[PDB]
């Protein structure tokens, strides 16, 4: 199976440098070129550059001066680096592979790395329960994931086992400049005495991992 | 660079219907166009290559046509899972460039929200902030009003909303409204109410609690 797995999301200060690692498997970097594409609110999808099988590189014109792509064939790693970051460089960065060695029809994508370009400092969130209260046999419950920077946090339930009826809402920016996010799930009210419910929260930029058990309040 | 123009920006259809996305190029690009799907929280997925060529693992209901400057991606019978954005890419001319995309939305029957309200936790109150949360669950269409009242005082400017994208299976939306106040203010009041207005309700539905039960 062909896969591309990228390093985690990060905060970078203005004028500072960016570094992402793409690690591939199911093919060899000696046979395929790896492309870089970013996606931003302002500019949408932009192709940035490519490192070919033999090690040559092409950079999209506005990036020639502040972009370098490198790799280690034996380690199956591609190294993306961009200098002189400004605010509009905040985007999701992807690595990608084409169908054939020389082409640009991107059939395989990395999961994407969100890079936030900002002067602020990293902050890990607090996790608070949204406790079920005493809906025709259905109870709702959740977690409030509050006051973190930058994006993203991942949230899951019962270590990935519970997915049905889960809604994890988009994060919103509070006036404080810190993000906040809620995640809910509906379950049978009669399973509240039997099953445990835990939201698993991860804020990689601050290395904060929290498991919050959510229970009906006393 | 080649400018790719995608129209319209939003498409709204009912399941089973046929649907077409347009990609127009600023000059001839032969058949050098690829189409991508981006679902909620996903990476782009390659649907069609070189205008009309199929991709392994892609449902047969996806097809493309066109050449020169006018291109079309078609879904013959739309499914709810097709809810996503669709992008075109040209590669006749370096550098490869992408269109701005077209959003595909699905219609469905009206569905009233289920409404739940959650008091702040004792845990959060320790920090000196109180978050009151109102959940509107699995409803359609997206339009909804959430009005907050504290001891009959209409709240304004102190809440924030967030809405899920359409559910891939039942096409509904869900919404959270969070009312945020100081611990001080929270402790100075009793009745916390969330009033929900929506097309699927004959009357607004209010959920409320008294601080401290």
């Amino acid at each position: 199976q062909v896969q591309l797995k990228q390093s985690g999301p990060g905060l970078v200060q203005p004028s500072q440098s960016l570094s992402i690692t793409c690690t591939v498997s199911g093919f060899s970097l000696t046979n395929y070129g790896v492309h870089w594409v970013r996606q931003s609110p302002g500019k949408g999808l932009e192709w940035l550059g490519v490192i070919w099988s033999g090690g040559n590189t092409d950079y999209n014109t506005p990036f020639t001066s502040r972009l370098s792509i490198n790799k280690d064939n034996s380690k199956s790693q591609v190294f993306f680096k961009m200098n002189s970051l400004q605010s509009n460089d905040t985007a999701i960065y992807y690595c990608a592979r084409a169908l054939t060695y020389y082409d640009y029809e991107f059939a395989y994508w990395g999961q994407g790395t969100l890079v936030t370009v900002s002067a602020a400092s990293t902050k890990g969130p607090s996790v608070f329960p949204l406790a079920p209260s005493s809906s025709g046999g259905t109870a709702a419950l959740g977690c409030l994931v509050k006051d973190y920077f930058p994006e993203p946090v991942t949230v899951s339930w019962n270590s990935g086992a519970l997915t049905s009826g889960v809604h994890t809402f988009p994060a919103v920016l509070q006036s404080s400049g810190l993000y906040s996010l809620s995640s809910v799930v509906t379950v049978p009210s009669s399973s509240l005495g039997t099953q445990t419910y835990i939201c698993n929260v991860n804020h990689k930029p601050s290395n904060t991992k929290v498991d919050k058990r959510v229970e009906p309040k006393s | 660079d080649i400018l790719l123009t995608q129209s319209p920006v939003i498409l709204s259809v009912s399941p089973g219907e046929r649907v077409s996305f347009s990609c127009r190029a600023s000059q001839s690009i032969g058949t050098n166009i690829h189409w991508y799907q981006q679902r909620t929280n996903g990476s782009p997925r390659l649907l069609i290559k070189y205008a009309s060529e199929s991709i392994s693992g892609i449902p047969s209901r996806f097809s493309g046509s066109g050449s020169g400057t006018d291109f079309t991606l078609s879904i013959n019978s739309v499914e709810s899972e097709d809810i996503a954005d669709y992008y075109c890419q040209q590669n006749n001319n370096w550098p490869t460039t992408f269109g701005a995309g077209t959003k595909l939305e699905l219609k469905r029957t009206v569905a009233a929200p289920s409404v739940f309200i959650f008091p702040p936790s004792d845990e959060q109150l320790k920090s000196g902030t109180a978050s009151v949360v109102c959940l509107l669950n699995n409803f359609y269409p997206r339009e909804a009003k959430v009005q907050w009242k504290v001891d009959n005082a209409l709240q304004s400017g102190n809440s924030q909303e967030s809405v899920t994208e359409q559910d891939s299976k039942d096409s509904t939306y869900s919404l959270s409204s969070t009312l945020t106040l100081s611990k001080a203010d929270y402790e100075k009041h009793k009745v916390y109410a969330c009033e929900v207005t929506h097309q699927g309700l004959s009357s607004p539905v209010t959920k409320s609690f008294n601080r401290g039960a």
């Binding site: 949408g44 999701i92 994006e151 988009p170 994060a171 | 981006q38 909620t40 929280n41 996503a84 995309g101």
Partner: peptide
Amino acid sequence: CQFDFSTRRLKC
């Protein structure tokens, strides 16, 4: 329309 990180979807 604009790409939104939160959902990785276009917001109009």
